[PDB]
Design goal:
Elements lengths: L1 E6 L5 E6 L4 E9 L4 E5 L7 E11 L5 E5 L18 E8 L2 E7 L8 E5 L7 E3 L3 H4 L14 H5 L2 H4 L9 H9 L14 E4 L4 E5 L4
Parallel strand pairs: 1-12
Antiparallel strand pairs: 1-4, 2-3, 2-5, 5-6, 5-7, 7-8, 8-11, 9-10, 9-12
PDB class: plant protein
Keywords: Water Distribution, Thin Film, Langmuir Blodgett, plant protein
Assembly: monomeric
Length: about 210
Amino acid sequence: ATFEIVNRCSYTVWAAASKGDAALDAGGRQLNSGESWTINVEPGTKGGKIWARTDCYFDDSGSGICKTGDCGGLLRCKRFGRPPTTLAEFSLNQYGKDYIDISNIKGFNVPMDFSPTTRGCRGVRCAADIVGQCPAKLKAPGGGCNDACTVFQTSEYCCTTGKCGPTEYSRFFKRLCPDAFSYVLDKPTTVTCPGSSNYRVTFCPTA
């Protein structure tokens, strides 16, 4: 499946793509403002995620640090990134279908649109100014808006017991972006696409 990842932000981002125990394609690449990077993701990929990382420095071997979404200091991500990270999430060819969503469960760093480029389903978007509006206690001094689990480590925010409800913090993300997951048990905003769709992830789709 092809994912065209496009940076419409006015700032550079370093895109990242992983399924948590492996890179997808090269796993990561710098995208200057306006650049597009097309990756190939193997059919059947379960639990893949794409995100942006901001304010990164890499040496000549691809080792360094990002202020948001760092994946163990690598340019080419092999694991998931450090919160806060707006997440494009997808499981492909799952009994005939693809499933996509955007999630703020790990916080928010960069706005995103995640849309099929082939027929038969709608895209999802979380493009509101969540960093500018972020509640004081969730603001990440590093950049971005953390989710309450990352900040407070409680069963209720982390849904550790499987039994949690919405909270004042989850409701903030859900108010600014109704079309993304705001906590683990949020009412699903997952979109079902034809098996083997192709997609485009656009960072800063409205700015």
